[PDB]
Assembly symmetry: D2
Homo-oligomer: 323 residues x 4
């Protein structure tokens, strides 16, 4: 009677997604992790709060050291992919990408085997490239796969704007597309407080500072935690995407999506994932909005595109060599 | 305009409490931790999710490496104490109790200095003894201090019953008083599904199994996590206590509370904290309910009483030895 | 995509149920009424609050003057029957019973014609008899039909107890079975505050006054409104039953249910609807709990049974006369 | 304690506001109405649903045929004024305005007497003029009074756009200021779906249709209800204003607000209430945003201003011959 969501990865991010989905009563939640005991423990800890919170859900966790346990994903409406590494001492983010692509390949093949009907929300960073790897490995029709990106950048951008202007978080709207960091592309003219353009409220230098803080917002958290990365804001940023699919909400949120056909004319890429505004519903990507760029936005977009093309070619090379 | 809650400790439990209070919109939340960056990081990560969740709250974090930062607790309606250690099989429970009592002493001294008007919710285990230590150190009127105990044991007990009977978590009621583990005292006769006693619904053998799992429920999670203890279920168990104070809900939940006067005739302890059913309101403990014990419950209670008396005497001795 | 609920009757009670289901995001909601414009108006008014409340739901209303509009019920998981008429004195309530039985016959035939797969929650008073009429008219398997009764009496009883004792409404449990008014049968021994029996907390004289107030709680509201009856508390009392079906919650709540087989040995009625504790799930009634009556409860139950047997015979006679 | 809200008027709108505040747990809610039994009945019906909904609030109702019952407003953080005269046949719009101004005088005087510290949210239509009457009658500092307008027009406009574009209600933003009907002034250029201008999504003819439907949105519901006016969407539209004050959320929403000083240079009125974007906080109006008009908007605004000047002049004339 209820929708089913699987979460792959039971670390801080995946477990936060699971706890968030339970609070928001999105559906039954099954958690998966290769680490002995981890997914089972997170699921139980989350489930044990149900009598206080009020959620009547089936919440379970499984160890995938025996990959056969991936069979428990069967019937999932959405699978959230959060498995993967963060940098180890002596690892470039270039080495990290390659490592994570390999994990995506394994995960995608498991999804293909046990739950090929699911829509997929890919979280592992950079999620545009990891969504691409999931697509290549799973064979799932590409409109059914989306990557986390803009939901998180926009929530940070809104937070900073709201604090600066001393207004409710609900009334700030901050428009971003593309990736994280230098690949992020804000449309300041589309950012506002209850419709009032930010450019009518803050001077350029202040907006610039806020844009910068947003670009490096993940690193800001890493520098505070020292030994881990953000998970609270990512968790809810992911959950709002998931629930839009499960409950067919038709939220319009920038996410990493597969660009093809007429959309390639606007976004200057073809057959790749990159962050663009999408309508999210029961079928996955229900619509890609084609934006109109001014010159600054276009030049910024071109840089973002080159980074994605570069990293996607790396994923291509990996799959070509590892049948 | 909003109430203010301070959370001392920004590890898994304290930060979960903070995120939980934010979701339930309990009030502004200030987080404190001796580890540089940690409380600020947890606060920012939680705050950055505000635009998606919808909470319009001030959420801040501070480093207490210098105790002067505790000045930021000023005007807190509730302070949640989650500071303290868990050494694991290296030193005994006794060494651990002593370590934590010392932490409560310094925390309580800081509370007296910077926010002596606050109600306190003590989480550090065993919370009855740690509440007693907070009382001795802070000088706060003892009705204004409560310890986490029954809120958590009861949520676990209810989860297990509901799954065994395949019923809503909302309709299961599980009655426990006393401490954790062998110090916990269930009243099976007061446990029911929508009023129907559980003894009419399950074989005694199964009820005993569920009682034992509840006793060692925290250990069950520790085994699954390997390197840490439960935090999700404790987080909401703590938040329901905090919000009952802040919003004067008059919840009736078993918590560690100070027993004196006529209540000592019922609970056989005097001037100590122990887990009993209390009405929780804006003034802290607004009523202690005096239970009638049957013979089995009485026996079990007396054992719990001896444990609390013994550990409380250890706390007295520590305080006597340290001015 | 989403679950669908139809509400028949767009008066105060039906429209309150609709707005309640929307707020609680239970599913898409279609409203039906014979009165031109009424259901369409209630639906639009409710839908137009969606941007503030947050519910992304399809909410529509239809006039059933042309009965073919009932085709819009197709695919409903649950249908709520609130259609009915009139008052207590003035005209005879026996005359009223017959009139409402006739409306149930028409509504039941429409359901069989257009949405025979739905579970049905019957609200029209007395809902035990009206559920019986829906069953006779619709041919729907009887476990898939339940009547409002206990959910509303228990919420009133809980309210009165919580006010008297100055405790949270969440922690009061009040046990009733049977019908309304003199037909209601409280189990004082199964009523408690967080497990503590109310007999341990209030003088018997007070409990008796509260029981009497619950019996005549509907009349208390009529006395205040003058020209109408209660709708806010009924609305939520109905919605918790509906959502238990839609979301398969397994709530345990007393409702009017079809009593047969071994249950007839406990409840002394056979092949009739009467208020008993049931587990409510995606299949409708998933369990009837068989209580053990003490002498006093049994004597009260026999009276309630006699009233239901009499009125069910009247319903039988009506159907026999109009086949 | 908890925050307290008084609601004056226990008809459909006032009682809907009360039930909405309860569900949203905004604070204690006291309802007042001159008609014997009505406020008491609405309050009790609402309170009796608390055990199911979960709100632990003091909800009470009083009949103000005895004026002294207004003493029960004491300590209210916000007072919501919904009392008004139902328009009688043959009564002109100006005659209705005069009657309602008279009711605002009585209400304002009771507020001045019994709860002069309150912020006021005025609902009685037209709320700009009625806010102005409440100001004249109560002597309350005018930044502490706001009138319902744009919150309701915006929610309707958002509903229509979301349905037309098949997107989530959460992501549509519809910018309006001024009054209702022909006094409403939309800024199409500030209306968008997740930042994407609606002028990039819909052609002018479709946008015009939706603007027009919004202008006469109230009338559309009246034509469906036939015997009354909208209340569900107004209820939540009001409640979001009220909770922004009580919980100091700093929502930015167009409301009727007192225009003076520098703001008069932008809005072309002085010392009158008219609908403009405001930041709503614990002090009432925390900020008025000064918009930049194009020619169409300026001309439409001048019309809106003239209507407000004319009706405010009628109010001045009324107060001048009654004191």
């Amino acid at each position: 009677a209820r929708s089913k969501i699987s979460v792959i990865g039971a670390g801080a991010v995946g477990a936060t997604v699971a706890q968030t989905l339970a609070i928001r009563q999105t559906g039954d939640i099954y958690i998966f992790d290769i680490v002995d005991g981890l997914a089972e423990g997170k699921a139980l800890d989350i489930l044990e709060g149900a009598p206080h919170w009020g959620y009547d859900l089936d919440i379970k966790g499984f160890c995938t050291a025996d990959e056969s346990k991936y069979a428990e994903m069967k019937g999932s409406d959405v699978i959230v992919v959060t498995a993967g590494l963060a940098r180890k001492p002596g690892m470039s983010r270039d080495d990290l990408l390659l490592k994570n692509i390999g994990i995506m390949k394994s995960v995608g093949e498991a999804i293909k085997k046990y739950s090929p009907e699911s829509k997929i929300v890919v979280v592992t960073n950079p999620a545009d490239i990891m969504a691409y790897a999931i697509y290549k490995a799973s064979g799932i029709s590409p409109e059914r796969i989306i990557g986390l990106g803009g939901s998180l950048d926009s929530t940070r951008f809104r937070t900073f704007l709201a604090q600066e202007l001393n207004v409710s978080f609900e009334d700030v709207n901050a428009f971003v597309i593309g990736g994280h960091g230098d690949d992020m592309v804000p449309f300041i003219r589309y950012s506002n407080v209850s419709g009032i353009p930010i450019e009518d409220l803050l001077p350029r230098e202040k907006i610039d500072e806020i844009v910068k803080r947003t670009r490096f917002g993940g690193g800001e958290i890493v520098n505070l935690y020292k030994t881990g990365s953000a998970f609270y804001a990512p968790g809810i940023s992911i959950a709002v995407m998931v629930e839009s699919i499960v409950n067919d909400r038709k939220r319009v949120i920038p996410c990493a999506a597969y660009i093809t056909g007429e959309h390639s004319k606007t976004y200057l890429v073809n057959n790749l994932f990159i962050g663009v505004p999408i309508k999210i519903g029961k079928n996955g990507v229900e619509k890609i909005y084609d934006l109109k760029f001014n010159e600054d936005e276009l030049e910024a977009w071109k840089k973002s595109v080159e980074s994605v093309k570069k990293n996607s070619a790396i994923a291509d090379d990996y799959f070509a060599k590892n049948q």
